[model samples]
Target: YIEYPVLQKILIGLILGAIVGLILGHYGYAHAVHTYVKPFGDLFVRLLCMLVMPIVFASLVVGAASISPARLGRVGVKIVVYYLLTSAFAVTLGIIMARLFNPGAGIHLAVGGQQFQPHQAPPLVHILLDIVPTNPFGALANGQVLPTIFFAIILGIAITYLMNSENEKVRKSAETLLDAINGLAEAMYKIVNGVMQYAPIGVFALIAYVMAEQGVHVVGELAKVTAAVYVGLTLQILLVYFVLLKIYGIDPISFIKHAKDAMLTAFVTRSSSGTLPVTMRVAKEMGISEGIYSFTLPLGATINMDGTALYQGVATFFIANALGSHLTVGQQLTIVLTAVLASIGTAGVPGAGAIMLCMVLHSVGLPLTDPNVAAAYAMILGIDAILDMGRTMVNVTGDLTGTAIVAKTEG
Candidate 1:
């Protein structure tokens, strides 16, 4: 028997699962991988998601209330800066990479009869209004993240005020209540760690199942677009994410060690929200204070989508090229602004990836209502799952990077 860290075990499972999937897929047995093996991955996601609501609610309340009211605004400002600024950088990086790679150069395929509605993501105003939840249980029970997050933080701030109240009756009981919520959060962490033990098995099955199901379609005419997104992801991770870490005194290798589990989980699951339990656990190991991560992580998972924005850039420009058009500078600026707004707008919206691309494309005059535009969008959709894995990894990393740095600033 040999000792192995969880990340190593996960890697072993990840690699093995992919190899098995590829072989089986090539040998025309994807039916078996999809039918037989994917359920294990589903269980892993279900268990993680099942455990996230309590952790998020308890931790956000605890984290927000634990902060000094004076310092709370300062922390809030910094986290938002980190999220917005980095996401802006991410989309720009992707556009630059797109310019360099020309992934959509001269591979024009005639596209028609692909009925596409283009996802109708809600407006920014409604999303902002939606932030204030109607009922706590309604939001929390259904896993409606943005509303619950808003409710939790507001509740936390209320507790903070009470804890600082002049009246002993209010203050003492407020402290006791906070302690209970904090305890609940801690217990969830304990349970989540046990679930983390199932991660490798889940990671393996999810990766294998997808690979076997898809048969590596990235190997075709779309390969360049696939390559462009992946290459853009790496540059975003290093030039933006690691540079921020270095400035904040976190070693790159150490951040990766602390972050690998969440990154891999995000890749396999393609959901920042779904990966929160693993992220919180890793942030705990990284020694980011509960006060910071509890709020920032949940918020980041919802609003800070560096990866999606980056992919938005890649995919939009890829569409432009596919349709034999180009984006002007003003149109490019619109892309950046719309990318940022769309990231926020689509928070907690289901199947947001294509919808986000549609938003960005519409901002640049590539409405999916056009038959040719619809066809090009379909081309991107063909490779959407593979593209999502990278972007989701970047999105989760962006969250942790902000959380860690914001905690450091609190001192």
Candidate 2:
């Protein structure tokens, strides 16, 4: 009963996914739908992820190739510093909001009731070592984010450095390879775009399934925690971002006006990585310099995430409060520290926010494997996708803001 085109296929998939979820929910078939239908969403995302490394590798190489070496190195520092500061601000925002609101006090998941095997945070040395992949292909096959990014950035800088050296023939050959890689990146973008056209439908289906399976009652059940977490997110957008805007001499209203479409698209797609092209485009339109935007945006899309950091803060604090355990000032400080470091490499991974949270909990001496904790997690999980959309908006905004702020500083 539906007209078909390549774009329409995804549209149909979305519609069908929603319909199936709703039908299952209405008929007490929610479990079957979640188990069977959810995997399709996973598969779709994996296909998109498959393109990330090659695209990132190619773009970084080409972008580096376009810039002078000295300027490239200078901008790189600015980008990293911007990422670090913003991520720290995001986590701190969440911690302060949670402390102010005490969102977890209302929910009582019986203490020590459900036990979980907490995952240990990898050592700092291990984390660093892992970034330089021995088998780059293995990292690609596994889709490891940090190592791939590390390899790409290093390779990009090297190629650029070589191109600017005195060997004309070598430069020409390097240009040819770069051109081929760039072409492959473009083709991948098209395929990714083709897949994304179905996003609205996928979201509809995903939401429908969640609602049907969990029922609307679950929202009512976790209202306080939900309210608290979202409240923190709102404060991050309004208070933190506005302050950053003022400090950087940006017109906050103008920035938002220009970014609204990208923000909306992030909400719909629920993938910050998926929103990269739009975010990068919006940053340039908002007058972010090409040098900064070209480098920072792609890197930020892959790494910097204020929204996820905020979520982690709220979730961690909520869990602590729900257990009637007051975190020490030192522990709260650790939350800010860990969240900032974790954001550098967590992007484009599914459920990474939770993984980051797990890391934070362990860092601060919280139990990682408490089964009752899952109940707390489950409560927020329902609303996370919608919340993630808001976070992606913030994430991209932060990226652009970082680029603008750094560019202005350089000028």
Candidate 3:
């Protein structure tokens, strides 16, 4: 009676993964089994990455082309602005909350240590230049997300503009091409669903390897980081997102109910991108406009980081406190600015949040170059999966919020 085997396979993967992880963790990399464990996570991510450009490009173009150019322009502006403002607010919220809680207080950095030095991210101009993507084909091959997105947005706009002119033949051809793209995207999603049948096994193997390798120390470090992240997520949901929903005249509980399946899938998969099809499904069920949700939700999965922002904020505090360095007013403000910009700048890169955290740490003048600090980070990496699940939930929620807001505003 099972309609789809993805969830079942994922559960199986989780179970087997736990067993394998424990065995590997206990055995300490001596066994040949350890080799297989490492690749499962990478494989899953690769599978997800394989679909991203096609799904995102086709979906965004079709969604954009479907809308009136005037409305598309207005909606696009709203989305970019909203994402920027909310992302900044999220990181700032994180920094403020971290200051109050001080999750990293009392922990000490390991000895043979370097000074509390943080590396600075390159200038904004450098970052912007990368986004323009001198080689479009190279960007796709390298999975350069932002550049791919920029290209897609421009192509989508051009298609819409051509369709609106008096050239009936050109418009019809554009329409036919979009229809073909839409069908291809749908077929790809079905293939993805088939691939997901192995998720539970992969999860089981990945987690088992992780737990076996790190064991108790990883658990302990993760406890603090995990708690701090949850605290931030709770505040973002209750104080920030839900409050906005209330102001916008929607029921928070109902929204959550509608989103439950997709959220659960993201939690299990620990992947926002992997959960896109389900999220799109949920968005439609919630009465969100196709134009808004199709564009906003996919983009949001790439860039929105209410949860990751929270993690970075608290992690920075934790790292600082462990090293006995308290951030000043200016430093905290810098964290806000850096975290927000990093979130947007690294939106489509793999291991983006971690890379962004590195950026944030550097921006705030925290020492990340020390070997001991790297070891401490290793301690926290164990529970990252659990925290990632929570973060994906928040990310999906933010997508729903953006879609809803845009839809209501349009109405």
Model 2: weakest 10-residue lDDT segment is 111-120
How accurate locally is residue 146 in candidate 3, as Cα lDDT from 0 to 100? 60
**Measured by TM-score, how close is model 2 to the native structure?**
0.59
Instruction: After the best TM-score superposition of candidate 1, give how far the Cα of residue 153 lies from its true spot, in angstroms.
Output: 19
Predicted structure 2: lDDT? 0.60
| Per-candidate TM-score against the hidden true structure | 0.58, 0.59, 0.60
lDDT of 1 at 89: 85
Candidate order by TM-score, decreasing, is: 3, 2, 1
lDDT of 3 by residue, 1-411 (tens): 445545455555555665566656675562444466656654654554456556655555554454435635677678766666666678777777777665545455544545444455568798678668788788656656567666756666677777776889998987788778777755655655554555454455545554565353434444667777777777787777788788889889899899888877776665667778998999899888887887787667655756677767777666666665666757665665555443542232223444445444433444444644543443333234456667777777787877787788886
Tens digit of per-residue lDDT, candidate 2, span 122-166? 897986787798887786666555665566567656776666767
lDDT of each: 0.68, 0.60, 0.62
The number of the candidate with the highest lDDT is 1
